[PDB]
Design a protein around this ligand. Structure first.
Ligand SMILES: CCCCCCCCCCCCC/C=C/[C@@H](O)[C@H](CO)NC(=O)CCCCCCCCCCCCCCC
Ligand SMILES: CS(=O)(=O)Nc1ccc(C(=O)NCc2ccc(Cl)cc2Cl)cc1
Ligand SMILES: CS(=O)(=O)Nc1ccc(C(=O)NCc2ccc(Cl)cc2Cl)cc1
Ligand SMILES: CCCCCCCCCCCCCCCC
Ligand SMILES: CCCCCCCCCCCCCCCC
Ligand SMILES: CCCCCCCCCCCCCCCC
Ligand SMILES: CCCCCCCCCCCCCCCC
Ligand SMILES: CCCCCCCCCCCCCCCC
Ligand SMILES: CCCCCCCCCCCCCCCC
Ligand SMILES: CCCCCCCCCCCCCCCC
Ligand SMILES: CCCCCCCCCCCCCCCC
Ligand SMILES: CCCCCCCCCCCCCCCC
Ligand SMILES: CCCCCCCCCCCC
Ligand SMILES: CCCCC
Ligand SMILES: [K+]
Ligand SMILES: [K+]
Ligand SMILES: [K+]
Ligand SMILES: [K+]
Lengths: 281, 276
């Protein structure tokens, strides 16, 4: 009976699919409820700014203003500061930023503030990713090991002193609490504070950055080291180390959250069974 | 001896670290060599466009222009981007961790929800993508059961045909999940042949720079186009998930072969030098 389990597998996958379909629909409406208003409030107030310089300079062709703005937004994607009060310009592909870029490729964070424009840069980025992503995986896995065996020494000491008048499978709950607590301190809270001061971000923007980065979603709306401001350069190599170990942390956390879903799915799969079997007495 | 194994583990991690460090250094110089010139060529030709626009339109003064550009930079920070469909797109970019970033939350509440929506959505999507990987894998197992029957009754036998099977996987795999979609993006999006394959890899490896996004431009899209792209991603991600893992195991083998090749080079230099 090889096809027997396969019929049972397709049933499980199809239900998860429809859950994901419905989870996206929920998220979709939640986001547009949150972001549609600010969008329209800013599109109406950008047309207010539009006609303030549409008719304050009629001697501009007025179809070429909207083509001008295309030419600025097209060139802003490579990163430009097209100003006369600042015509000397730092490079986005210097010795360090191309090193940053390679990191965003193999980690699959891919902020996208810096992206290749040359046809050769694209072809190499394709080759660099298909080899670098697996290569980086072994590093991140070994970092997960070393970081995990450090925590194993930490709970060996703590699961010794909390042995008062003790069960085996319930202290596992205490160990997962100290993991998430210490974890969010070293890899979420403490770094976000540093980004708040050094980058100038808000308290929310920093934690937003930490999560979007270490989950490798990497929108790129916020990037550490993205400005010119000062950058001690004590700063940036520490952020590399943060990513290396912070990615290893969310790797476990996200896997823990996955197992929680497994349990919640089991509890709710049987709750529907109990709901049926009772059906109002 | 518990710390004896741990020293063997840290030495394994440290060497891989130094490989990744040096792999980044190689890549860094290679991209800088590739992209530093385009940067200068476009920085010089954007200043040409700037001082061209003051002369070809004396109407505008040098002082008005700096004001306009701040107002465009202000609007780049926002741009419908959040209509019924694009917010659905957005949630997809979150759970898949592709995160193109062409659309990103600006409201403080949208950020807080995106944090919560990801921490629960990313594991949830993993199970879907894992199940898609299973079903897709058992389909191809039916395919090799057929093909490992017709080739294996004749010319050269086992332990080398497993190499032939993985070639068929990668060959037809790149057909269904890289080549055939990239052709569709070339026509429908208007991209180049390179840009489409560039998109396919950046997207399905979940790097997702966001420089190229299918459905991101303002073009008429057939009602079947975007939902097929979802299905593509769902199954295309499952494809590179295996492909990247195959490439990982290749490196494992290559690491073993090169780790002993160094041992051979040393062992010859050893008793070639004992020859006095
Ligand atoms: C596209 C960017 C090019 C990146 C090229 C990086 C290759 C670096 C040179 C390979 C040797 C690394 C240093 C020596 C390590 C050995 O002492 C050690 C065993 O003792 N090997 C390993 O740890 C295991 C290491 C084995 C990993 C091999 C990586 C495969 C890269 C394939 C790229 C082919 C292009 C060839 C261009 C030269
Ligand atoms: C806007 S810029 O690109 O032109 N300037 C720079 C931008 C960023 C960095 C940098 O190292 N940030 C830390 C870091 C490291 C690795 C990874 Cl993967 C992600 C991150 Cl955030 C350096 C220069
Ligand atoms: C300015 S815009 O908001 O309108 N740009 C858009 C870009 C793409 C889409 C869309 O549906 N793409 C298919 C798709 C599905 C899931 C995933 Cl994860 C990725 C992708 Cl590309 C919608 C809008
Ligand atoms: C698991 C990661 C959850 C992150 C929660 C961090 C909470 C920070 C609150 C700051 C006030
Ligand atoms: C040990 C982890 C400490 C991480 C600090 C990163 C700060 C940026
Ligand atoms: C500019 C400084 C950024 C480059 C620092 C390189 C550090 C390598 C990773 C260390 C961990
Ligand atoms: C098999 C179907 C499993 C359905 C359980 C989904 C669990 C989602 C829990 C989200 C709570 C918020
Ligand atoms: C942040 C949004 C959370 C959305 C949670 C959706 C919960 C969906 C529950 C579906 C229950 C299906 C029961 C099937 C059991 C056979
Ligand atoms: C089941 C649907 C649950 C919806 C929860 C939405 C919470 C939004 C919080 C934003 C702050
Ligand atoms: C899973 C639930 C995690 C919720 C964490 C949200 C913390 C955001 C605090 C922002 C202030
Ligand atoms: C068009 C050329 C694409 C090159 C793909 C690189 C194959 C490795
Ligand atoms: C096959 C997968 C179907 C996915 C349904 C989502 C359709 C969204 C259309 C975009 C508008
Ligand atoms: C058309 C340009 C393609 C460039 C990709 C070739 C890269 C060669 C590898 C360099 C090894 C150091
Ligand atoms: C049939 C393969 C799906 C992508 C077009
Ligand atoms: K990204
Ligand atoms: K990713
Ligand atoms: K991005
Ligand atoms: K990403």
């Amino acid at each position: 009976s090889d096809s027997a389990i396969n019929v049972m597998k397709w049933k499980t996958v199809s239900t998860i699919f429809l859950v994901v379909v419905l989870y996206l629909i929920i998220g979709a409406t939640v986001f547009k409820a949150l972001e549609q208003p600010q969008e329209i409030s800013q599109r109406t107030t950008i047309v207010i700014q539009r006609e303030k310089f549409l008719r304050a300079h009629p001697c501009v062709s007025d179809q070429e203003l909207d083509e001008l703005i295309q030419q600025i937004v097209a060139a802003i994607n490579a990163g430009i500061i097209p100003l006369g009060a600042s015509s000397n310009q730092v490079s986005h592909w210097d010795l360090g930023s191309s090193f940053f870029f390679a990191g965003t490729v193999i980690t699959t964070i891919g902020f996208g503030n810096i992206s290749p424009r040359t046809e050769g840069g694209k072809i190499f980025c394709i080759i660099y990713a298909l080899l670098g992503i697996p290569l980086f995986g072994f590093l991140l896995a070994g970092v997960g090991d070393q970081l995990g065996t450090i925590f194993g020494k930490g709970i060996a000491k703590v699961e010794d002193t909390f042995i008062k008048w003790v069960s085996q499978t319930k202290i596992r709950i205490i160990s997962t609490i100290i993991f998430i607590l210490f974890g969010c301190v070293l890899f979420v809270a403490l770094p976000a504070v540093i980004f708040k001061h050094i980058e100038g971000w808000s308290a929310l923007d920093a934690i937003y950055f930490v999560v979007i980065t270490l989950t490798t979603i990497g929108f790129g709306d916020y990037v550490a080291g993205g400005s010119d401001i000062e950058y001690l350069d004590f700063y940036k190599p520490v952020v590399w180390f943060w990513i290396l170990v912070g990615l290893a942390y969310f790797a476990a956390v996200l896997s823990m959250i996955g197992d929680w879903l497994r349990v919640i799915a089991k509890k709710t799969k049987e709750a529907v069974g109990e709901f049926r079997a009772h059906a109002a007495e």
